Amino acid sequence: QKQFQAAVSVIQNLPKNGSYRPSYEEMLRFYSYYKQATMGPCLVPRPGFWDPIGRYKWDAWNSLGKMSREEAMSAYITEMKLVAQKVIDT
Ligand SMILES: CCCCCCCCCCCCCCCCCC(=O)SCCNC(=O)CCNC(=O)[C@H](O)C(C)(C)COP(=O)(O)OP(=O)(O)OC[C@H]1O[C@@H](n2cnc3c(N)ncnc32)[C@H](O)[C@@H]1OP(=O)(O)O
Ligand SMILES: CCCCCCCCCCCCCCCCCC(=O)O
């Protein structure tokens, strides 16, 4: 979608810190969908014990299996509405 690339833009230009503080879940959702969308199914090696953040990211992404690139695109957008909705209610 053009929408996906727009969503991605919004998120990329956000401030690193701010009034909303995203959950780890929220972060891993956006991260995994984004990888599924841009790189496809996770086929890289999984990071080791000394890289915990790498392991979480990988598990999230791998969890998506063989989800199509369109599938992940529209789920990214759905997650954006989800979080946007949380921010609106603050
Ligand atoms: C949610 C909607 C927004 C608001 C809705 C609007 C309506 C509401 C109205 C209210 C108005 C009030 C305004 C208040 C808003 C601010 C409040 C909050 O504090 S807001 C601010 C709170 N702070 C925020 O949440 C900040 C969120 N944004 C950021 O944190 C950064 O852009 C970043 C994390 C994506 C890093 O960028 P970068 O320079 O690349 O640094 P790294 O390379 O280290 O990134 C590492 C990995 O991430 C991967 N990846 C890349 N792009 C995306 C993507 N779009 N997605 C997912 N993943 C993406 C990338 O491929 C890489 O993979 P790998 O190679 O490691 O495997
Ligand atoms: C409105 C908020 C937008 C958020 C965009 C997040 C972008 C994705 C990249 C960040 C990687 C997530 C790593 C989190 C590790 C979790 C640690 C743990 O669960 O204790």
Curated annotation (Swiss-Prot):
Membrane spanning residue stretches: none
Every ACB domain range: 1-89
Residues binding an acyl-CoA: 11-20, 31-35, 57, 76
Role, per record: Binds medium- and long-chain acyl-CoA esters and may function as an intracellular carrier of acyl-CoA esters.
Protein's name in the database: Acyl-CoA-binding domain-containing protein 4
Organism: Homo sapiens (Human)
Gene transcribed to yield this protein: ACBD4
